């Protein structure tokens, strides 16, 4: 009884965002892969540090809340203000949408980039069950499983 | 203020080296001192306390907008260096992957 990411995500995985869950003579093991999870975290961070950046343009008063201005000039100010409100509100909702899609698709990319690495490692010694696991056709003790994780499997 | 008279205040900017000439024979409120500008400031209108303990850079009538987030849904008239006012109250940026729960078997 063990499964991969083609199905569901593991909730027991807490050292990182991706990991190996193996099964052999000595039993189950769940250990995160550090390189892949940092590569995902460091790109979401790259987004934050680009959008959190501040604007250094200072705007002053042109309206007057206490003492109203000419109806014409005020109406035109209101017209411009509400028009700018519409642009930023649009540019905002879209940016969140795009970056949320690029974020979601970013993490999926790094899961496969790890799955397709372990695949080339095992060469002709294992098969794809189809659910994100590898049926290994040779006895693999707890030491051999860790050789797959730290990229030493021969 | 009990007086049905009215005083109309006018103003002009006298260029350096220029002269303003007043010719009158009554009904003239006269200037005693001319005013000169000092430096840079920022005019805000408000209705809340001043607080020298907290440091801020964005002002609306209800106080100070202190934030790193690029948007704000507080006041469309805030002055200073401010986040952009947007119609929406909340826009959630994903900082994590798609959450797919787990099932036992």
């Amino acid at each position, epitope marked *: 009884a063990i499964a991969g990411f083609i199905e569901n995500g593991w909730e027991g995985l807490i050292d990182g965002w991706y990991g190996f869950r193996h099964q052999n003579a000595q039993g189950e093991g769940t250990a995160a892969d*550090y390189k892949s999870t*940092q590569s995902a975290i460091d790109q979401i*961070t790259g987004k*934050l*540090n680009r959008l959190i*950046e*501040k604007t250094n343009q200072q705007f002053e008063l042109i309206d007057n809340e206490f003492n109203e201005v000419e109806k014409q000039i005020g109406n035109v100010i209101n017209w411009t203000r509400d028009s700018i409100t519409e642009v930023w509100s649009y540019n905002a909702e879209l940016l969140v949408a795009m970056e949320n899609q690029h974020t979601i698709d970013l993490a999926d990319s790094e899961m496969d980039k790890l799955y397709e690495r372990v695949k080339r490692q095992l060469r002709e010694n294992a098969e794809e069950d189809g659910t994100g696991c590898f049926e290994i056709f040779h006895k693999c003790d707890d030491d051999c499983m860790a050789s797959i994780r730290n990229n030493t499997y021969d | 203020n009990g007086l049905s008279g009215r005083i109309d205040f006018h103003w002009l900017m006298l260029n350096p080296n220029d002269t303003v000439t007043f010719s009158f024979n009554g009904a003239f409120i006269a200037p005693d001192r001319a005013s000169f500008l000092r430096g840079k400031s920022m005019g805000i209108q408000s209705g809340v306390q001043v607080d020298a303990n907290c440091e801020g850079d964005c002002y609306h009538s209800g106080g100070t907008i202190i934030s790193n987030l690029p948007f704000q849904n507080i006041d469309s008239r805030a002055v200073g260096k401010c986040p952009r006012y947007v119609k929406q109250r909340s826009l959630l940026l994903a900082t994590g992957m798609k959450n797919v729960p787990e099932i036992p078997k």
Partner: antibody
Framework: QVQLQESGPGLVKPSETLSLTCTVS????????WSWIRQPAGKALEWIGR???????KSNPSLESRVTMSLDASKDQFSLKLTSVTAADTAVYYCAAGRLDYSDTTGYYKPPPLDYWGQGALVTVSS | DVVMTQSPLSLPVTLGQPASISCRSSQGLAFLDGNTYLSWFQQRPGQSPRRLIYKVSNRDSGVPDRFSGSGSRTDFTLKISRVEAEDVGVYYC?????????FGGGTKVEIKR
């Protein structure tokens, strides 16, 4: 109620294995991030690496080829080994600890906080 | 590597006067958890450095009132409200968001008495 005490040779020969060890007083090693920060004679602080129980010796690239960290949970001592030592590795070697929240999944992928420090050990590298 | 640059590099102040220290990072220091991890460290004569400010603004417990941290995402400032004779020493800033931990050059504060 926690204290970190460095210990080890005061001088190590050029190309030896500089070894040091931070002994923990009044706390469990299992519950912290463990950093080694070295300060050469009158220079900026240099952060060597950090480890935590269950292993993850994340280290600075300048020294990663030569750094080796491990920590014993029964003797309560962070340890450190810098192989092939140079005159550049002559420095004060403070060890440091940082809070470790098990559930903060995103905390293992961020440099650890530097909550507590030791007195610092001088390792002069000469012959 | 994130580059921590402090200024000034020697800050002689007058016993009981205020002063500030600017630390500019080569990169933004935000993290996924919403906190920007900049810290300020004070290393006094012949001692281990101790942490004054963590997370840009939060002051650590057991530290004089006059230490208040501030900053944005690239530009940060340590403010001392009233430097007394006991604040002599070297002051560092460290980013704590990006591998590896990096420290500022350090500012030498010497009291003018």
């Amino acid at each position: 109620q926690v204290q970190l005490q460095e210990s080890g040779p005061g001088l190590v020969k050029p190309s030896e294995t500089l070894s040091l060890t931070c002994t923990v007083s009044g706390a469990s090693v299992s519950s912290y991030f463990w950093s080694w920060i070295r300060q050469p004679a009158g220079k900026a602080l240099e952060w060597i690496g950090r480890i935590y129980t269950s292993g993850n010796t994340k280290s600075n690239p300048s020294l990663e080829s030569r750094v080796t960290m491990s920590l014993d949970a029964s003797k309560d001592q962070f340890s450190l080994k810098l192989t092939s030592v140079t005159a550049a590795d002559t420095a004060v070697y403070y060890c440091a600890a940082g809070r470790l929240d098990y559930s903060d999944t995103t905390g293992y992928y961020k440099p650890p906080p530097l909550d507590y420090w030791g007195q610092g050990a001088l390792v002069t590298v000469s012959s | 590597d994130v580059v921590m640059t402090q200024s000034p590099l020697s800050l002689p102040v007058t016993l009981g006067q205020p002063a500030s220290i600017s630390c500019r990072s080569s990169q933004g220091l935000a993290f996924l958890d919403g906190n920007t991890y900049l810290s300020w460290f004070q290393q006094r004569p012949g001692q281990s450095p101790r942490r004054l400010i963590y997370k840009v603004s939060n002051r650590d417990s057991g530290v004089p009132d006059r230490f208040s941290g501030s900053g944005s995402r690239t530009d940060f400032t340590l403010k001392i409200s009233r430097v007394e004779a006991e604040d002599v020493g070297v002051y560092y800033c460290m980013q704590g968001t990006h591998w590896p931990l990096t420290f500022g050059g350090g500012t030498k504060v010497e009291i003018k008495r």
